[PDB]
Design a protein around this nucleic acid. Structure first.
Ligand SMILES: Nc1ccn([C@H]2C[C@H](O)[C@@H](COP(=O)(O)NP(=O)(O)OP(=O)(O)O)O2)c(=O)n1
Ligand SMILES: [Mg+2]
Ligand SMILES: [Mg+2]
Length: 427
DNA sequence: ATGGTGACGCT
DNA sequence: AGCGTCAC
């Protein structure tokens, strides 16, 4: 029976990423409790990234900076750039490109977010194992690697524990067998050490990584020993790891589906799923989800690392909460123009860098009283990278929504505007 | 009043 | 197409 051990997959995730971008730029922020904040005026601004020094004080994301300062009076802050009246993330996108380009030298990557990429190292491992004629794997090749589940069986400090586990792992390895999945993961980890060394050397940024046989285990592994460490999760480690792993920790189960798995089956931990037949899981959660859960709780997943380094959409949005909701046509048109101007600049850059053009413009709004992320979503043709045309067109496709008799007024007021370019073609 | 991103499934 | 879920 298939054991889901055919691939070597890593997930690299940058440590407190936006903070590291700002600390590289401003040495005064290095090795300090510090956070990145967006929009100073309302409660000191919203925190969106937090250094590990600040995390020790209890500072978190989705905290107002005024409140964070109560937990950490010496907290240092770096502000997100604002342009055309809104937060602008260009600096972090550019830093992301630095890291993605380095990772791409080692293998084809799947960009999973601004600061994460999956890597399929199956081929690189095969070639490295051949150049490694015999040759045991030294612990010195794995200086920041944790082996999840080890040490076990018959030191009081972290690094001591890490080494004992690594020693047990390496001592047990079957280096004479090049088809051994554990051996393949170990070689994968050596390559990821090299990848992470290159990222830090060439950018100054530290990161963590997971190495396993699929994306979900690699992602889970990555978080086990953050920051600045990497973790190998073998197929064998899965039963003990999952036996006390809350279901919500597994990627895609952190929301309503995960909550329904818990409620419907009356379980708490990922490993408890093994008790159910594939048909039983499909009966509760659908064919796709059921099959996925049945395999995943056994450490098996087939979701491929997709060869994609570039985002498939480029979007610009702004919210206008509470009393600031947009109530005039002048207002709506001004802000659509602001969004369209940012989008134009990003699109033009994208076309020069990446030899493609977007062909569809998606416009989304939220009206006051409405409670969803988006109220109304409409698309139209994107034929010209011109901000005035795009903003004019967006207005055209959303002017239907103005239920107001007076058309110089806007009702109900708008609490969100969103412009997104999609459907890219080669150019 | 976290805000501003982005991928992908469903019908 | 437009809506919803899930994630950083
Ligand atoms: N809700 C969120 C989550 C992340 N981000 C941004 C800021 C983060 O630095 C960056 C990466 O997100 P992240 O990986 O979830 N956390 P971060 O890299 O800051 O810390 P780690 O826990 O990964 O060390 O995306 C955001 O702007 N809004
Ligand atoms: Mg990160
Ligand atoms: Mg991340």
């Amino acid at each position: 029976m298939a054991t889901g051990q055919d691939r070597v997959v890593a997930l690299v995730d940058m440590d407190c990423f936006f903070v590291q971008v700002e600390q590289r730029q401003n040495p005064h922020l290095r090795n300090k409790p510090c956070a990145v904040v967006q929009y100073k005026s309302w409660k000191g601004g919203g925190i969106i990234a937090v250094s590990y020094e600040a995390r020790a004080f209890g500072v978190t994301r989705s905290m107002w900076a005024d409140d964070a300062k109560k937990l950490c009076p010496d907290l240092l802050l770096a502000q997100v750039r604002e342009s055309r009246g809104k937060a602008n993330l260009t600096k972090y996108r550019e830093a992301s490109v630095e890291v993605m380009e380095i990772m791409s030298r080692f293998a084809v990557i799947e960009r999973a977010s601004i600061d994460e990429a999956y890597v399929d190292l199956t081929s690189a491992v095969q070639e490295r194992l051949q150049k490694l004629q015999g040759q045991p794997i030294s612990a010195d090749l794995l200086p920041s690697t944790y082996i999840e589940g080890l040490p076990q069986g018959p030191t009081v400090q972290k690094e001591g524990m890490r080494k004992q586990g690594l020693f047990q792992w390496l001592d047990s390895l079957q280096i004479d067998n090049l088809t051994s999945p554990d051996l393949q993961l170990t070689v994968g980890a050596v390559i990821v050490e090299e990848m992470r060394a290159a990222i830090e050397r060439e950018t100054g940024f530290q990161c963590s990584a997971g190495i396993s046989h699929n994306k979900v285990l690699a992602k889970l592994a990555c978080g086990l020993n953050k920051p600045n460490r990497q973790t190998l999760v073998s197929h064998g480690s899965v039963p003990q790891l999952f036996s006390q792993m809350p279901i919500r920790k597994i990627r895609s189960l952190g929301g309503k589906l995960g909550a329904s798995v818990i409620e419907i089956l009356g379980i708490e931990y990922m490993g408890e799923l093994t008790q159910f037949t594939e048909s039983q899981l499909q009966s509760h959660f659908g064919e796709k989800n059921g099959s996925w859960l049945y395999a995943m709780c056994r450490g098996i997943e087939h979701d491929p690392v997709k060869p994609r380094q570039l985002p498939k959409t480029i979007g610009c949005s702004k919210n206008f909460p509470g009393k600031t909701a947009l109530a005039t046509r002048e207002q709506v048109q001004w802000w659509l123009l602001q969004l369209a101007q940012e989008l134009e600049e990003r699109l033009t850059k994208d076309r020069n860098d990446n030899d493609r053009v977007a062909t569809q413009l998606v416009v989304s709004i939220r009206v006051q009283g409405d409670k969803r992320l988006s109220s109304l979503r409409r698309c139209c043709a994107l034929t010209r990278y011109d901000a005035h045309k795009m903003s004019h067109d967006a207005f055209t496709v959303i002017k239907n929504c103005n239920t107001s008799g007076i058309q110089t007024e806007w009702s109900p007021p708008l609490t969100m505007l969103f412009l997104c370019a999609t459907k890219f073609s080669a150019s």
